[PDB]
mmCIF file of N, CA, C and O in Angstrom:
data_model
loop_
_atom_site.group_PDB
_atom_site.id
_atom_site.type_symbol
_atom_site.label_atom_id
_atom_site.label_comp_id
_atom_site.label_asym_id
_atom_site.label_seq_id
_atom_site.Cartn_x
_atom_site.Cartn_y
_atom_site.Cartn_z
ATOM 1 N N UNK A 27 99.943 105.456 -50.311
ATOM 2 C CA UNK A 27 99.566 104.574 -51.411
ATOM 3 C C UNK A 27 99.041 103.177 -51.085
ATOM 4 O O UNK A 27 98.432 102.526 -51.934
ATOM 5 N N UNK A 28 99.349 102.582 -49.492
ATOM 6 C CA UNK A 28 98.721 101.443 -49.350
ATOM 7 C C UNK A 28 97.337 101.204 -49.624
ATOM 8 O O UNK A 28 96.966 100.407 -50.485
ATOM 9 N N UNK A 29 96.553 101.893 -48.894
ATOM 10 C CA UNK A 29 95.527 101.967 -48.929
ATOM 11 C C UNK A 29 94.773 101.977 -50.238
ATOM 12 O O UNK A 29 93.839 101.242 -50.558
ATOM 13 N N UNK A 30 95.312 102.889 -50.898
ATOM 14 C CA UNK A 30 94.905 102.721 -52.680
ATOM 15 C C UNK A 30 95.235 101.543 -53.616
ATOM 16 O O UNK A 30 94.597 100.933 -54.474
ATOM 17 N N UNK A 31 96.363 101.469 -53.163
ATOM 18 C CA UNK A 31 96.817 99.634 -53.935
ATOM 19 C C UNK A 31 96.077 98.664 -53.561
ATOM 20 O O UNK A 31 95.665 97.963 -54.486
ATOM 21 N N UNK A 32 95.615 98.243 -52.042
ATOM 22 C CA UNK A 32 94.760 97.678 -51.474
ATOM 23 C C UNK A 32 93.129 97.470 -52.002
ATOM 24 O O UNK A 32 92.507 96.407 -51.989
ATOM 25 N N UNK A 33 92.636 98.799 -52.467
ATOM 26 C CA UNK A 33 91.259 99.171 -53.155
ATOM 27 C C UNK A 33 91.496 98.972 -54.725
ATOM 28 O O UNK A 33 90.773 99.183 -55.699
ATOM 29 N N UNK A 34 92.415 98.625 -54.622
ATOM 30 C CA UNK A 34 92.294 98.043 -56.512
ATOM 31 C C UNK A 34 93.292 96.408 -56.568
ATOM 32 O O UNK A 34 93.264 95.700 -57.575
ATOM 33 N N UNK A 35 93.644 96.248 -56.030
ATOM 34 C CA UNK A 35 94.087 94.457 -55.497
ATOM 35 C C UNK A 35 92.500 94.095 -55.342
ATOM 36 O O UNK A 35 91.947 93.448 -56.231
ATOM 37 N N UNK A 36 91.689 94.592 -54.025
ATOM 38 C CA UNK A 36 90.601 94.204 -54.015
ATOM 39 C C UNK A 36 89.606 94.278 -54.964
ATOM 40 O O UNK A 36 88.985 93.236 -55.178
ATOM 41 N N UNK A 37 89.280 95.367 -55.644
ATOM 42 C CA UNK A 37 88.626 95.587 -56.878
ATOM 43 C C UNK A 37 88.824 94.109 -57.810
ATOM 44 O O UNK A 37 87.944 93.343 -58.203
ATOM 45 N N UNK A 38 90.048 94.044 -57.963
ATOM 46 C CA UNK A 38 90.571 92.968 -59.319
ATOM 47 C C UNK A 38 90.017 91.574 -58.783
ATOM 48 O O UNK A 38 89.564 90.785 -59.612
ATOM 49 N N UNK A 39 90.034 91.245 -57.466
ATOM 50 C CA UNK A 39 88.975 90.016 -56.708
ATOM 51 C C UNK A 39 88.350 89.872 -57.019
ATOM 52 O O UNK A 39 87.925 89.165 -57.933
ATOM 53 N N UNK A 40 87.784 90.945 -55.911
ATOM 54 C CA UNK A 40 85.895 91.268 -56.514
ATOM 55 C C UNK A 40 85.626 90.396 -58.098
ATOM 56 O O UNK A 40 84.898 89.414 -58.240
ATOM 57 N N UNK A 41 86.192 90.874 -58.849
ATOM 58 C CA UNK A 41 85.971 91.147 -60.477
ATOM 59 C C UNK A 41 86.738 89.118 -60.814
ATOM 60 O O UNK A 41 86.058 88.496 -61.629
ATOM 61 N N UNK A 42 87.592 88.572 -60.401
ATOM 62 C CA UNK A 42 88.027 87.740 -60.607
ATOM 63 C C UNK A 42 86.800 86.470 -60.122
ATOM 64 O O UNK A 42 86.533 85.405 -60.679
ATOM 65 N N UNK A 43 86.316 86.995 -59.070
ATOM 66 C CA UNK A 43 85.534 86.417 -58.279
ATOM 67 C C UNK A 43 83.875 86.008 -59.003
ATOM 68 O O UNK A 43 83.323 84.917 -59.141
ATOM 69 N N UNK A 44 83.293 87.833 -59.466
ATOM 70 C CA UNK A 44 82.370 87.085 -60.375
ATOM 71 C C UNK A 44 82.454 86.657 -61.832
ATOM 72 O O UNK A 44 81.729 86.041 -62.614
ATOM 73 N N UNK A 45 82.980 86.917 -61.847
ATOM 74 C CA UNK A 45 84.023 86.546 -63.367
ATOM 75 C C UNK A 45 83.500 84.540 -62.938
ATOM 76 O O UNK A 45 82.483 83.948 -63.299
ATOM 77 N N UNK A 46 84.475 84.103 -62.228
ATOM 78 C CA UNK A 46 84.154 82.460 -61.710
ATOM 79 C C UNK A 46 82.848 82.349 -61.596
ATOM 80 O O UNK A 46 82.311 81.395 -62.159
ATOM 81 N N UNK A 47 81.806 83.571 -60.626
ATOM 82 C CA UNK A 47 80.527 82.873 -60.366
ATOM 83 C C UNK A 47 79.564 82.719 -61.678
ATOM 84 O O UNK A 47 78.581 81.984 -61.585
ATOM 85 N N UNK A 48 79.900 83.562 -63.175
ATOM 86 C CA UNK A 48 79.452 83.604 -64.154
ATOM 87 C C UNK A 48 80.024 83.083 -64.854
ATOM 88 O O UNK A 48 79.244 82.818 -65.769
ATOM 89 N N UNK A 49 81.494 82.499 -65.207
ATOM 90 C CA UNK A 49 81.622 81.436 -66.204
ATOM 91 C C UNK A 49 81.154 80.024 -65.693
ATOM 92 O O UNK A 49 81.174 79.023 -66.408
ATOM 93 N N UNK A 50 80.704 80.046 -64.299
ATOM 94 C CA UNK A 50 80.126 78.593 -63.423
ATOM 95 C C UNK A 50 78.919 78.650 -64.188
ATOM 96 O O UNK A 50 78.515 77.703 -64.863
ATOM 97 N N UNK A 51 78.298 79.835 -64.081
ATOM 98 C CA UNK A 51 76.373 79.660 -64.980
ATOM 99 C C UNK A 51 76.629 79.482 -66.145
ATOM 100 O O UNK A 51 75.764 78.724 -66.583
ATOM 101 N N UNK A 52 77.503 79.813 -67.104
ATOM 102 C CA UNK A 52 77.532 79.575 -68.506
ATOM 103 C C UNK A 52 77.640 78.292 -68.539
ATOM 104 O O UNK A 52 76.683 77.701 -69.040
ATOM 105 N N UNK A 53 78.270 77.843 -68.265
ATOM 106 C CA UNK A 53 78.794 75.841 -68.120
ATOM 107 C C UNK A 53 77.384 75.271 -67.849
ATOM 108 O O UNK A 53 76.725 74.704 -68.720
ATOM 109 N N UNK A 54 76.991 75.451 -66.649
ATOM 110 C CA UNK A 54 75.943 74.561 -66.053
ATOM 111 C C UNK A 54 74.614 75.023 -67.068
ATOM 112 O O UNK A 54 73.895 74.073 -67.377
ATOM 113 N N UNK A 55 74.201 76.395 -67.630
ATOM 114 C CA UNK A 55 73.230 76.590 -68.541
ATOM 115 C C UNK A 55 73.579 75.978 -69.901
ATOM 116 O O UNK A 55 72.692 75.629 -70.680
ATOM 117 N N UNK A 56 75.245 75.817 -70.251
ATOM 118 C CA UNK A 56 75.317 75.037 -71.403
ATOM 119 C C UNK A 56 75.157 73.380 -71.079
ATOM 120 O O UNK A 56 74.630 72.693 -71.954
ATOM 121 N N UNK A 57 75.610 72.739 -69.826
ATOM 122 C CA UNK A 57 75.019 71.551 -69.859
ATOM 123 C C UNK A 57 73.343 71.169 -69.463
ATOM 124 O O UNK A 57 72.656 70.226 -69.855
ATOM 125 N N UNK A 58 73.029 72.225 -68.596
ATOM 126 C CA UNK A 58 70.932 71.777 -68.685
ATOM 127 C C UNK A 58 70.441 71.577 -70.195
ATOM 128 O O UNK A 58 69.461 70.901 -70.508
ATOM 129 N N UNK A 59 71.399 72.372 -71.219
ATOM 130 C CA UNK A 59 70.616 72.078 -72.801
ATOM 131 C C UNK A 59 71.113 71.183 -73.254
ATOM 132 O O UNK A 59 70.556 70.779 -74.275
ATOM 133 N N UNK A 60 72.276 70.453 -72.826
ATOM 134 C CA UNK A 60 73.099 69.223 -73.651
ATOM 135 C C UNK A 60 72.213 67.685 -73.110
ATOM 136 O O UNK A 60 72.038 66.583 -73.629
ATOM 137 N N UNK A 61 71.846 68.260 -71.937
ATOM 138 C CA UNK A 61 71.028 67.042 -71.837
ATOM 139 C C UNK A 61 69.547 66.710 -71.741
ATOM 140 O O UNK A 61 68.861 65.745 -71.404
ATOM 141 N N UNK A 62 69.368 67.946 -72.187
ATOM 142 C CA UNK A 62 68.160 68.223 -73.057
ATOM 143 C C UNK A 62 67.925 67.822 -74.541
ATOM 144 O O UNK A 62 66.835 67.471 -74.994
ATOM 145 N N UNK A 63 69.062 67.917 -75.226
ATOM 146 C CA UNK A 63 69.165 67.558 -76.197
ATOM 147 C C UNK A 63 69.435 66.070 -76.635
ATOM 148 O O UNK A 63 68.951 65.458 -77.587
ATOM 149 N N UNK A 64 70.151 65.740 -75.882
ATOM 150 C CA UNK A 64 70.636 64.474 -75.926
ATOM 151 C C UNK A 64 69.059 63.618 -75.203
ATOM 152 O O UNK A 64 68.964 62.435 -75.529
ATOM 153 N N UNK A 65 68.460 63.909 -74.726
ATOM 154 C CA UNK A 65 67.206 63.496 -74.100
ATOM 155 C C UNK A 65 66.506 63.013 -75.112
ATOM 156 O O UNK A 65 66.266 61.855 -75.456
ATOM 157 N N UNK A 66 66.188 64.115 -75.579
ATOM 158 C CA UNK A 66 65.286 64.211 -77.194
ATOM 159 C C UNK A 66 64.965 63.803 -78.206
ATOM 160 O O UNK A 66 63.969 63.449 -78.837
ATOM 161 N N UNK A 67 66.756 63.987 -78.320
ATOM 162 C CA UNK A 67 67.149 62.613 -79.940
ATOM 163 C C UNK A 67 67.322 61.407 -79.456
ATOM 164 O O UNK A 67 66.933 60.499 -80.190
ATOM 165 N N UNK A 68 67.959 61.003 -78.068
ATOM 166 C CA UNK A 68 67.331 59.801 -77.750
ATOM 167 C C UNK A 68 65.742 58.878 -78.007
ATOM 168 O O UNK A 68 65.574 57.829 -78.629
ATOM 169 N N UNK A 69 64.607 59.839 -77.178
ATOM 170 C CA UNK A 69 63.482 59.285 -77.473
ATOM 171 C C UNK A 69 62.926 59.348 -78.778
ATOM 172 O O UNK A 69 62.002 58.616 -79.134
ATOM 173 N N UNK A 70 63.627 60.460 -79.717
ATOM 174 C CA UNK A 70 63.216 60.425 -81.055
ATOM 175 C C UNK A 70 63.428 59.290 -81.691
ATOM 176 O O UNK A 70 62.919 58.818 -82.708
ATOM 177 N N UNK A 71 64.511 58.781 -80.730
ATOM 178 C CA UNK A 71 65.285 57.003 -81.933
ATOM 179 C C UNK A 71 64.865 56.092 -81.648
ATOM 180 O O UNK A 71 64.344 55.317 -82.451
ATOM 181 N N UNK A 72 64.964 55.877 -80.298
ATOM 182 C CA UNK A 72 64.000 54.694 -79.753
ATOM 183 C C UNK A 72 62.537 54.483 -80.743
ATOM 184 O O UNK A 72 62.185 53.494 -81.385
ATOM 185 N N UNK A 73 61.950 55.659 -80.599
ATOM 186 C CA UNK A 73 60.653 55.550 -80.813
ATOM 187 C C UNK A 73 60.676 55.443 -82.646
ATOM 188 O O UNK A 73 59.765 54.886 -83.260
ATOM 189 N N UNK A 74 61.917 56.101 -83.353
ATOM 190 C CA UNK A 74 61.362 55.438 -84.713
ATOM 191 C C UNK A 74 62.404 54.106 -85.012
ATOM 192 O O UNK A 74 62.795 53.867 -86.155
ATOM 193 N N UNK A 75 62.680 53.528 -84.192
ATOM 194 C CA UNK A 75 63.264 52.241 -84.061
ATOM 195 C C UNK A 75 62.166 51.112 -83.547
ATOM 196 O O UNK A 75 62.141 50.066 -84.196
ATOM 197 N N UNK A 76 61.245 51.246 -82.417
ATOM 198 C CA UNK A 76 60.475 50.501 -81.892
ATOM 199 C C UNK A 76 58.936 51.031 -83.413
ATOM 200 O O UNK A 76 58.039 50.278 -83.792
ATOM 201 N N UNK A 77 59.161 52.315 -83.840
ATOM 202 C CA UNK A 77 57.892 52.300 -85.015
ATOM 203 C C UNK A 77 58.608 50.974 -86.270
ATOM 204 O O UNK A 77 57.800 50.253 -86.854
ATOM 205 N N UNK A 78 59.887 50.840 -86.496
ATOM 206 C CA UNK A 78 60.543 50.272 -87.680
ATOM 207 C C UNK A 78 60.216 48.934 -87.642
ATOM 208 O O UNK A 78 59.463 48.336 -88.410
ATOM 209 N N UNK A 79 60.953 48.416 -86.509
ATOM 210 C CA UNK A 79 60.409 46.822 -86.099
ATOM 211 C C UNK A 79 58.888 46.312 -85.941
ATOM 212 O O UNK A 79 58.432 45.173 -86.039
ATOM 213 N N UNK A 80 58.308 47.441 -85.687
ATOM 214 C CA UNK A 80 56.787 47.100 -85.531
ATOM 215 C C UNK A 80 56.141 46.485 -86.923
ATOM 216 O O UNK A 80 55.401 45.522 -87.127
ATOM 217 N N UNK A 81 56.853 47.634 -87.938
ATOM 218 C CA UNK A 81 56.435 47.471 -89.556
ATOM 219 C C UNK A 81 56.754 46.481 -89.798
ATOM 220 O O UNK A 81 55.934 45.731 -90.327
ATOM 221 N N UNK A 82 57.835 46.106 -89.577
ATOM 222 C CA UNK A 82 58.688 44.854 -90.451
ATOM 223 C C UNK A 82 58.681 43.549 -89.334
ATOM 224 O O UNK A 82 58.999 42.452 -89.794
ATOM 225 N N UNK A 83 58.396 43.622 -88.164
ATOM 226 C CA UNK A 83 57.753 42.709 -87.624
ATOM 227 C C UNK A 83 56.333 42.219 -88.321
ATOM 228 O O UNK A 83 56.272 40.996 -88.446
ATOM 229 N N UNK A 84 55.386 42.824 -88.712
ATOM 230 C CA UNK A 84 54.382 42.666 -88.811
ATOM 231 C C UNK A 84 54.451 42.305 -90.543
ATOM 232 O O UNK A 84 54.199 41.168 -90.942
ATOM 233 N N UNK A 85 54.759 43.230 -91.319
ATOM 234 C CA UNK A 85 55.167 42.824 -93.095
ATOM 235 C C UNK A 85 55.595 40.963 -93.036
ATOM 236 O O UNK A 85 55.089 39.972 -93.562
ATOM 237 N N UNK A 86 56.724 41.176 -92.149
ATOM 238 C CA UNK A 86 57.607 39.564 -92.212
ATOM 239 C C UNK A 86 56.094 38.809 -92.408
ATOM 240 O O UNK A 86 55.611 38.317 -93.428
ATOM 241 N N UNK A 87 55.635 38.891 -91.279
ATOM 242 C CA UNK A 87 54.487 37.533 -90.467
ATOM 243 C C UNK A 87 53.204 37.567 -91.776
ATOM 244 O O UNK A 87 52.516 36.644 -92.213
ATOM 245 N N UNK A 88 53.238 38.843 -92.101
ATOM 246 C CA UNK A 88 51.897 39.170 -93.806
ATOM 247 C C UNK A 88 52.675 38.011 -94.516
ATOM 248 O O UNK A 88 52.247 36.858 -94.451
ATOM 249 N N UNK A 89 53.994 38.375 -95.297
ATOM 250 C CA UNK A 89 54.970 37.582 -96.237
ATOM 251 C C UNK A 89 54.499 35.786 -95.949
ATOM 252 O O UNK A 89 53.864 34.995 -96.647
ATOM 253 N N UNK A 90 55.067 35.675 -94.781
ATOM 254 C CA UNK A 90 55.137 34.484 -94.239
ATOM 255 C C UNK A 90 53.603 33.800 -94.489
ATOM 256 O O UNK A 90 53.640 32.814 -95.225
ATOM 257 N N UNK A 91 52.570 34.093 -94.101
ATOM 258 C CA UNK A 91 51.052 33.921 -94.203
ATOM 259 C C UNK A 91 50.759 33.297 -95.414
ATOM 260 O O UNK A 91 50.506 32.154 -95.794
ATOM 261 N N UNK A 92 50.925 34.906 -96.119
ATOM 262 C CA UNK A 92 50.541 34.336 -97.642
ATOM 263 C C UNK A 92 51.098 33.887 -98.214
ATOM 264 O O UNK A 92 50.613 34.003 -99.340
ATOM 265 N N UNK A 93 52.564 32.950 -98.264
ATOM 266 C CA UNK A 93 53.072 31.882 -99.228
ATOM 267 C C UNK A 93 52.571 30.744 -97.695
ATOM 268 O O UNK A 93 52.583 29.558 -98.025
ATOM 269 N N UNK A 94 52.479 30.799 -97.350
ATOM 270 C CA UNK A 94 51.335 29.324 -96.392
ATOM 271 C C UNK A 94 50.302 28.984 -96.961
ATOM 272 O O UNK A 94 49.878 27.909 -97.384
ATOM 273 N N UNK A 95 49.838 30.251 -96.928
ATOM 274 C CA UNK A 95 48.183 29.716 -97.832
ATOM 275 C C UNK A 95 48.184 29.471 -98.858
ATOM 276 O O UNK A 95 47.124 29.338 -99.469
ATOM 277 N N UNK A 96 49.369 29.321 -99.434
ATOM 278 C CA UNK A 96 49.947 28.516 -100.810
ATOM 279 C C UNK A 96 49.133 27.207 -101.000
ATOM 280 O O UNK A 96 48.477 26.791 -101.954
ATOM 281 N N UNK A 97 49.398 26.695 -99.763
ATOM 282 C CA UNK A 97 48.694 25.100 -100.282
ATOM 283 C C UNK A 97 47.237 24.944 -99.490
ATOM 284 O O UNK A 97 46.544 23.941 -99.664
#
């Protein structure tokens, strides 16, 4: 029976073994998209944050103008 207990001890390795090398790819394929994502909506904000200030930078200085040319 050694020999047979031995071939299924080892079997359950084996199996424990890629078991680890495939919950390692699930992790690392779930973080390549987290910071993908997080990438994304980053530049999405920036960019309608730097579009927001542009507007209202520019509205202010219109506002400002035309009660100048008041007098």
């Amino acid at each position: 029976g050694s020999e047979f207990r031995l071939e299924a001890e080892r079997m359950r390795l084996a199996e424990e073994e890629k078991l680890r090398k495939e919950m390692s790819a699930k992790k690392a394929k779930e973080e390549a998209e987290r910071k993908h994502q997080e990438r994304l909506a980053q530049l999405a904000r920036e960019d309608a944050e730097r579009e927001l200030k542009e507007k209202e930078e520019a509205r202010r200085k219109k506002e400002l103008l035309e009660q100048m040319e008041k007098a």
